[PDB]
Design a binder for this molecule. Sequence first.
Ligand SMILES: *[C@@H]1O[C@H](CO)[C@@H](O)[C@H](O)[C@H]1NC(C)=O
Lengths: 49, 99, 99, 31
Amino acid sequence: VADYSVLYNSASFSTFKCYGVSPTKLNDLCFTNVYADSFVIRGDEVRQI
Amino acid sequence: LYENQKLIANQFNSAIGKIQDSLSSTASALGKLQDVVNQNAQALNTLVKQLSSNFGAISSVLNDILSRLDPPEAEVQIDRLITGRLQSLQTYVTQQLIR
Amino acid sequence: VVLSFELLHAPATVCGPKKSTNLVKNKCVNFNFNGLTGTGVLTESNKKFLPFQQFGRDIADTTDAVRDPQTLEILDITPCSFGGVSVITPGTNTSNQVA
Amino acid sequence: SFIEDLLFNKVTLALICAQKFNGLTVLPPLL
Ligand SMILES: *[C@@H]1O[C@H](CO)[C@@H](O)[C@H](O)[C@H]1NC(C)=O
């Protein structure tokens, strides 16, 4: 069970673009599975992905 | 006629019998009615089947799109999906009026 | 961090901690069975089903058969009974009562 | 009539109740 309501709440997130669905609606739908791809990139190319 | 009344009746009833057998033999002798019914039901089947298409939107289940996206973007998404369904229903109605 | 979501028809594994509630029968409800946000009454039948799956499709291309995510049970969704209304009415000057 | 029954049972008519669930019902014929 994921607390997707509160993960969005941390104000550290400076570039929070949810192309998939709206952020607040992360709470209701049930995910088949999930990919969690983590890395660190340049400050300029943050929006190239 | 009065010279051949019994013969006329005999031929008439034999014709009735051959009609019975010809109808009861094969289905495609009665073809026009089957053609019309199949055409109508198949057009309606295509109409109802058309609902499975995303028409370029996120999905085909409208309630899934309602749950997924927010109204400010569900606006454009549902706009695309509704215009697609509207076009399909419109062409169905025009062809229905043709027939 | 990119969170990639493959929302589709599959066994639900991870989702929000919203409080569940027991079912009802013969009363159409605004259910949400892991994204299946439809409406209708819930009944049962004797049909078969995949051991793990949760969705049962139809020729109309929508979810008809469901398996409960809490307790594995066969459920039939039939959308809440509805039709159309035909206001039989004579001329407005003739009367104001309408059938 | 006798021929009429042959004709009735020889035409096959139409899933069907699934159509009713999406608005597009079939209005009954008048006669
Ligand atoms: C009033 O209703 C009757 C009902 O038959 C109709 O015949 C009549 O024309 C109506 N009156 C007017 C002024 O239209």
